[PDB]
Symmetry: C2
Subunit: 321 residues, 2 copies
């Protein structure tokens, strides 16, 4: 139903944005460093920031679609929860943060965007420093919307592998409910998928069950029911939205341990993430997924997810003036 209109609207807005790149220095993105706004490519951070020297940070990425922020409060709440888990504190009041983000989006002119917030430990690390001398740092940026699966590929589905050379970092080492930039396993998964002639890695928990991939959650569909891992993964806002849509449609969702074998016996597969939305998978380990076409439940969820971007309960319009 909705792919043609959603993608044609994006293409039209994107053509306007691209036409402005020689006159609007923020059309390729804008960043906030130390209270100053700069073109994204020009943004620089201290080499000794502990977000670099120990990846001692969390981040979150709400999005803007067609000039409407999508579930912004959910993302800021998750960022605050991640900060609490790491003993960080968002460095400005949350209402001020939201005001800055809206200002940045409006100044950029970007209708479709990813809006990244990063909170780091600061210039002084946990080791040795008296806890009262720790001052956490905040970096924020707006960039043109990033696609983990491009629109043309979403029309046919992508190719995934269950990774065999790497598995997901377990929660008792690094908590995956804290969105983080320690991607060592996820980068290994991306290289493995490419080495195997595929694009997307699905990582196991190291114990014969599925977790997530390189920046996305995994959903399996079998006999009219959605299955998605509970433990070992980020609790995605896209996944939350999939659950809202499934509930509205009367489709059961099981958020539980998902055995690896189910990926080989299921009727449909899709990935979900803010950077791309609902991303069908139609080849797994080199084999068609149940015939190789995008499935009917995936299509219903796809349309429902994008409709939520216009529902006032999940989105709001930004004033670009």
């Amino acid at each position: 139903a909705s792919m043609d209109k959603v993608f044609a609207g994006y293409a039209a807005r994107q053509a306007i944005l691209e036409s402005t790149e020689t006159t609007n220095p923020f059309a390729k993105g804008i960043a906030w460093v130390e209270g100053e706004l700069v073109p994204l490519a020009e943004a620089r951070i201290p080499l000794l920031d502990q977000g670099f020297m120990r990846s001692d940070l969390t981040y979150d990425v709400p999005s803007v679609w067609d000039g409407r922020f999508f579930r912004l409060d959910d993302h800021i709440t998750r960022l605050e929860a991640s900060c609490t888990k790491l003993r960080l504190r968002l460095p400005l009041p949350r209402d001020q943060v939201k005001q800055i983000l809206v200002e940045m989006v409006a100044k950029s002119g970007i209708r479709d965007a990813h809006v990244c917030l990063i909170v780091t430990r600061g210039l002084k690390g946990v080791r040795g420093t008296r806890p009262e001398d720790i001052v956490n740092n905040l970096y924020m940026f707006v960039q043109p919307y990033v696609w983990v699966m491009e629109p043309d590929m979403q029309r046919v589905g992508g190719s995934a592998v269950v990774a065999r050379t790497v598995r997901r970092v377990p929660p008792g080492a690094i908590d995956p409910t804290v969105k983080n930039l320690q991607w060592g396993d996820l980068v290994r998964g991306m290289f493995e998928a490419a080495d195997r002639g595929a694009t997307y890695p699905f990582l196991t928990d190291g114990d014969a069950h599925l977790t997530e991939g390189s920046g996305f959650n995994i959903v399996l569909v079998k006999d009219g029911v959605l299955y998605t891992p509970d433990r070992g993964v980020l609790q995605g806002v896209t996944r939350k939205s999939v659950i809202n849509a499934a509930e509205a449609f009367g489709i059961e969702v099981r958020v539980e341990f998902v055995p690896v074998e189910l990926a080989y016996r299921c009727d449909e597969i899709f990935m979900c993430t803010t950077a791309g939305g609902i991303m069908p998978i139609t080849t797994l380990d080199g084999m068609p997924v149940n015939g190789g076409q995008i499935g009917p439940i995936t299509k219903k969820i796809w349309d429902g997810y994008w409709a939520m971007h216009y529902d006032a309960a999940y989105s709001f319009e930004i004033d670009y003036n």
Copy 2:
């Protein structure tokens, strides 16, 4: 034997270094960014460097002691091996890198230094980018020598706990032989140690065997034999030096699986790392280690390690001009 002389020499050189800070802007450290040398506190990197945005990097840290580089070639070789494991290439030829590092140390005037080299994926990530479009980035810096255990604590020994709230990232998720800045588990360990009234965390593999801690390897001594984990840890150059010293002294070193129980029954414990050297642990989980005094084999290894800093087989003198 050697602690007084080693630490008095360092204290004397530190007083000289501090006296140069008002006339040498590099005396507090110097960094190399994009071929330019800048005072360390002023060094900045692009916000979108994938070393920041995905911790997609490796690093290595040779040191200078009393104006002598210690095992520099071993560290550059390990950096190149880590780069190979991550599909990264050191940006400059290794002989040019060494010449730059010596130049930077000389300009700083620092005689006791840590010298950090970082190789990142660059401005374009693994995902999506044509492999030929990837250009890796190099950052280097010299800083005054950093102590994981300060000199006066090395005199009496430190307190450790076997961590119970976190375990080490396993090798099939992130390879710990690649020195890396993805410290999520190690930072959790440091907070746990502090919460439990100790200074250092020892992390298990979760499977009842010891690995390493927050920036150091772990050595247990029992009945005249040293034991240190093989799998799950960085193959430290300090640990290598401990092995060289032990072999010279006729002390057996077993690099093998070390059950957690051995830490509670052993005669001595020490940590080892380039940022501090040989670091005795005299309480574990609140209990004195075999009486709570620094042990005789620890002291022999301590003295042997520092002697190797003046042996031409392991070191060379920098010309500071």
